[PDB]
Amino acid sequence: RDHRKIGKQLDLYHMQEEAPGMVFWHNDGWTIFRELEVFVRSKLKEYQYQEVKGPFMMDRVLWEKTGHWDNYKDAMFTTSSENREYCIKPMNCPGHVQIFNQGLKSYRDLPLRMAEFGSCHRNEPSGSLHGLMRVRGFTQDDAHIFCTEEQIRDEVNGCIRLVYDMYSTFGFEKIVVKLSTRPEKRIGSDEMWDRAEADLAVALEENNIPFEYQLGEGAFYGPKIEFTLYDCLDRAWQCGTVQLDFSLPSRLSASYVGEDNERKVPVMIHRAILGSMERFIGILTEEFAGFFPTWLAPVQVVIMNITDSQSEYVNELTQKLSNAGIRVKADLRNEKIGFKIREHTLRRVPYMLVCGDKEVESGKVAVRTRRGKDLGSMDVNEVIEKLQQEIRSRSLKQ
Amino acid sequence: RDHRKIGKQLDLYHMQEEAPGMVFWHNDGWTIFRELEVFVRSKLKEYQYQEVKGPFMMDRVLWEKTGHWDNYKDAMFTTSSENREYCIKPMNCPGHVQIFNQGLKSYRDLPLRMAEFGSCHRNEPSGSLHGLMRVRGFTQDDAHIFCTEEQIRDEVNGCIRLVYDMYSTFGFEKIVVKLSTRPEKRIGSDEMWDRAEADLAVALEENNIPFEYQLGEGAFYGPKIEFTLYDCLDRAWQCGTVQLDFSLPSRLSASYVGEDNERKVPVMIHRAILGSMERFIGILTEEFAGFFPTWLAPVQVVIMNITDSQSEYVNELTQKLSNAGIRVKADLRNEKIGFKIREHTLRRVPYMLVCGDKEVESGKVAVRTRRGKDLGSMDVNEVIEKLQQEIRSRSLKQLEELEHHHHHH
Ligand SMILES: C[C@@H](O)[C@H](N)C(=O)NS(=O)(=O)c1cccc(-c2ccc3c(N)nc(Cl)nc3c2)c1
Ligand SMILES: C[C@@H](O)[C@H](N)C(=O)NS(=O)(=O)c1cccc(-c2ccc3c(N)nc(Cl)nc3c2)c1
Ligand SMILES: [Zn+2]
Ligand SMILES: [Zn+2]
């Protein structure tokens, strides 16, 4: 099953030729995107990250300084104002360094873990575009960690732990790890590259992760661990990545006062856990075939009456569920109950609540699922409590 | 005092010459921005809006169709790829119409209320930039409501109600209102403009809102109700806006099937309640002189020790308040208690919890506020419940406080 067809069927998003690789998120697709942001934030809280927002564009001069212009030009969108050229950002790192550079920093501030849901644009050749997996405007669940050389091992380990921790929520069985080494166009000395490649290889082996080399595929600023996930046709897509950069901070004048009083340049680790939100949603859509786990489902519950005798009761339950934090809709249409059920089933709504007279009298609801399971009559507080529990726990199934 | 000074004092954001009018939101400024988004979303839910996201750029051809290119050229950033020219969006409406245009719509789908926290770029002259109040990259709390002619009155009324409901949270009740009428460069006939302008004026009159006309200040596509808020120098800033558009949907081929199976063009109401998130934060910053309401405060509570002795206790409490969802920091420094309180007062932290030996003994805290008030000792659990209630109700004022800091009484 193809996420593109499922995305159309569940009204998640669309694209058009007046904006190639530019996603229009419809309400239900945007709901998923927003839930993933909530999830990422909850994890960024426990793993102790700041969250910032950098400028959408910056002067071409700044991108020249980083090496992005010489080592990354063709991918960049540019725009002008008052005789000055700007690049629309393809990466968030330089903005993060600019924020780091505001206010004197010391060893007391490190590791400084700076996250952003960073909207990037890259002028990917139009012939390489594919659904939500490869677009031109995407959002990374990005962060840069500023740390000392002594903190590299612990911070790289932390990023690797975060990847497997987050990925366990989604239950991915195939996670293939690559270590992408020095590309033909790069910055930093060969000696820097030897150290950075070794630090990553050693981090993988310490974490017991089998990996394959991807020779020459590292970033221009540093080598990359890549966590690869697979779509329905077993095509490989880079999602998670952890990268070690001994070059950009220096190019952007980042420094801090060390514990030993020597002013030094911080090491920077770049990482994304999901990758891009768009690509990750494309992957999830295929992984679940549109049957999103309840916490991610655009609409979690639909409540239906059989006739207008139960309209008032349906409205009452809908408000009760909505106040409980459940994404719930009432379907009060003048249509046969079996017509309504089929619509919501095809829409992959996890739970459907049917109210006839028997339900009104008893204060219960007849519960069924999008897999055709019939859970029979249930008391209303118990469905609320079970739903809340499965949402809060982000349960992979139920 | 100017929000730009307060913004530096509280480490909210910065700007640089490498990116004129593009905000760098630091952690604490972004905290306020995100809390405002959560607040708007609570209202989108209650008032039954969809929430979408349209892309940053679209073909110049589309912008020419709307009338934007003719009537809005100077303000648009453009970029290109593979010999096609794109506009970075200055407004979210055309993208909302593209979403509306996917799939057949019927009268049963209306009113369709489509919200977005819409990231816009307008190439404002660099001479006109001012802090957070006039930038080049800003985020509107935007929506478009697609509705029938018969629904205009109710839907405009709903937007007006939403403005006063949201502004009431901040204590803004006597709002200056204008009705901005047809500008010299416009699309649509005189007849359409007469109707749109009357509809908005009737809505204001029906809601008992006094207003003035502002001649020639309407959008190229329709007239605008404007809700003005004022900064520290009493300069007028457009924040809320409600606009009526009988032009763009037709230009962009929007239609729905009516009750007689006939093709109809929907009316579109545009509205932003806060205006932009950036400008609204600028306004709050100045109005409150940085004393943001607890629910908005980047750091809600600071817990501090007197000596190394209470460090373990402070750390326990910081963790406890953090698990309770409160934005809390520990201050473990070897500085006098008065020194700490002055610093966190300049940082506008609502509550400061002072931990001496006697506090460690009794499992309590000595409570101080950023307004100089000594609230005595309270139980840790009591402080948590009261903070949680202050946060959940988005209360304008603090524990046992008559009047919060605000410039305009
Ligand atoms: C992790 C970052 O700090 C680092 N600067 C970085 O950008 N590394 S990266 O390997 O280039 C990277 C990380 C995460 C996502 C992507 C990416 C790139 C292009 C994409 C594209 N064209 N479409 C989509 Cl849907 N996702 C994408 C995701 C790239
Ligand atoms: C309400 C919308 O749907 C409508 N399309 C629209 O954009 N109306 S609008 O009057 O032009 C409008 C609404 C809300 C915010 C603004 C606005 C414009 C420029 C701004 C700027 N340069 N800086 C800042 Cl901080 N805020 C701004 C807010 C404009
Ligand atoms: Zn990076
Ligand atoms: Zn609009």
Distance in angstroms (rounded) separating the CA atoms of residues A212 and B351: 53
Which bound ligand lies closest to the C-alpha atom of A120?
1
Q: Provide the b/e sequence for A54-64 (b: ≥16 CB within 10 Å).
A: bbbbbbbebbe
A254 is in an annotated binding site: yes
Strands A267-276, A137-147: pairing kind: antiparallel
Half-sphere exposure of A64 (CA within 13 A, CB side): 7
The minimum CA-CA distance between B109 and chain A, rounded to whole Å, is 12
Any idea which residues of A carry the catalytic annotation?
Answer: 93, 122, 140, 142, 144, 224, 270
| CATH code, domain carrying A306 | 3.40.50.800
Note whether A183 and A148 are same-domain residues: yes
Which residue type does A239 have? C
Distance in angstroms (rounded) separating the CA atoms of residues B238 and B21: 18
Note whether B382 and B242 are same-domain residues: no
Protein residue whose Cα sits closest to atom 7 of ligand 1: A91
Number of helices (H), then strands (E), belonging to chain A: the values are 13, 20
Q: Provide the b/e sequence for A352-370 (b: ≥16 CB within 10 Å).
A: bbbbbeebbeeebbbbbeb
CA distances from A266 to A181, A258, B210 (A): 22, 10, 58
Give DSSP secondary structure letters for B88-134: E-S-SHHHHHHHHTSS--BGGG-SEEEEEEEEEE----GGG-BTTTB
Q: Do the beta carbons of residue B355 and residue B314 sit within 8 Å?
A: yes
| Cross-strand bridge partners of residue B228 | B176, B238
Q: Do the beta carbons of residue B167 and residue B230 sit within 8 Å?
A: no
* Entry resolution (Å): 1.7
Distance in angstroms (rounded) separating the CA atoms of residues B337 and B307: 10
The minimum CA-CA distance between A390 and chain B, rounded to whole Å, is 21
Which DSSP state fits A50? E
Strands A301-305, A351-355: pairing kind: parallel
- In this structure, what are the phi and psi dihedrals at residue B86, rounded to the nearest 5 degrees? -120, 150
Half-sphere exposure of A21 (CA within 13 A, CB side): 22
Note whether B263 and B306 are same-domain residues: no
A271 lines ligand 1 (CB under 6 A): yes
Active-site residue flag, B140 = yes
Which DSSP state fits A67? T
Note whether A358 and A243 are same-domain residues: no
Q: Which pair of structure tokens corresponds to residue A281?
A: 């949603």
The reply to whether residue A119 touches residue B26, judged by beta carbons under 8 angstroms, is no
Note whether A296 and A272 are same-domain residues: no
Note whether B51 and B127 are same-domain residues: yes
B96 lines ligand 2 (CB under 6 A): no
Q: Name the domain boundary from B289, B321, B353.
A: B289
> 3-state DSSP call for residue B12?
coil
Of B60, B96, B113, B122, the active-site residue reads B122
User: Cβ contacts of residue A346 below 8 Å, gap of 6+?
Assistant: A9
Q: Which pair of structure tokens corresponds to residue A58?
A: 């910056």
Q: Do the beta carbons of residue A365 and residue A303 sit within 8 Å?
A: yes
CA distances from A339 to A9, A375, B105, B201 (A): 17, 19, 20, 45
Distance in angstroms (rounded) separating the CA atoms of residues A273 and A288: 19
For Cα atoms A221, A21, B140, give the angle at the middle one, nearest 5 degrees: 90
Helix %, strand %, coil % of chain B (to 5): 40, 25, 35
Note whether B244 and B368 are same-domain residues: no
Q: Which pair of structure tokens corresponds to residue A120?
A: 């990037």
Closest CA to A142 of A206, A50, A66: A50
Which DSSP state fits A30? H
Distance in angstroms (rounded) separating the CA atoms of residues A360 and A317: 10
Q: Which pair of structure tokens corresponds to residue B372?
A: 């100089």
Category of A332 on φ-ψ map: left (φ > 0), alpha (ψ -120 to 50) or beta: alpha
Note whether A251 and A307 are same-domain residues: no
CA distances from B220 to A108, B66, B70, B160, B213 (A): 54, 10, 10, 21, 17
Residue A185's CB: how many other CB atoms inside 10 A? 10
The reply to whether residue B23 touches residue A61, judged by beta carbons under 8 angstroms, is no
| Cross-strand bridge partners of residue B60 | none
Of B141, B142, B199, B245, the active-site residue reads B142
Residue B236's CB: how many other CB atoms inside 10 A? 12
- Alpha carbon A119 to its chain centroid, in Å, reads 12
Atom nearest to B279 CA in ligand 2: 25
Q: Do the beta carbons of residue B209 and residue B177 sit within 8 Å?
A: yes
Q: Name the domain boundary from B289, B323, B339.
A: B289
Give DSSP secondary structure letters for B224-274: EEEEEEE-TT--EEEEEEEEEESSHHHHTT--EE-TTS-EEPPEEEEEEEE
| Cross-strand bridge partners of residue A271 | A143, A242
Q: Which pair of structure tokens corresponds to residue B29?
A: 């400024």
Atom nearest to B278 CA in ligand 2: 25
B174 C-alpha to ligand 4 centroid (Å): 25
Q: What's the number of domains chain A is made of?
A: 2
Closest CA to A28 of A8, A50, A2, A58: A8
Strands B212-214, B176-180: pairing kind: parallel
Distance in angstroms (rounded) separating the CA atoms of residues A267 and B251: 53
> 3-state DSSP call for residue A331?
strand
Note whether B235 and B344 are same-domain residues: no
Note whether B33 and B139 are same-domain residues: yes
Distance in angstroms (rounded) separating the CA atoms of residues B116 and B52: 5
Note whether B391 and B243 are same-domain residues: no
Note whether B393 and B274 are same-domain residues: no
| CATH code, domain carrying A196 | 3.30.930.10
> 3-state DSSP call for residue A87?
strand
Distance in angstroms (rounded) separating the CA atoms of residues A198 and A204: 10
Give DSSP secondary structure letters for B107-118: GGG-SEEEEEEE
Q: Do the beta carbons of residue A258 and residue A120 sit within 8 Å?
A: no
Residue A173, exposed/middle/buried by CB under 10 A (0-12, 13-18, 19+)? exposed
The residue segments making up the domain with residue A302 are: 290-398
Closest CA to A81 of B138, B123, B57, B131: B123
What distance, in Å, lies between the first and last C-alpha atoms of chain A?
A: 22
- Containing A165, the helix (H) or strand (E) segment is helix A152-170
B219 C-alpha to ligand 4 centroid (Å): 9
Q: Do the beta carbons of residue B198 and residue B242 sit within 8 Å?
A: no
Q: Name the domain boundary from B248, B266, B289.
A: B289
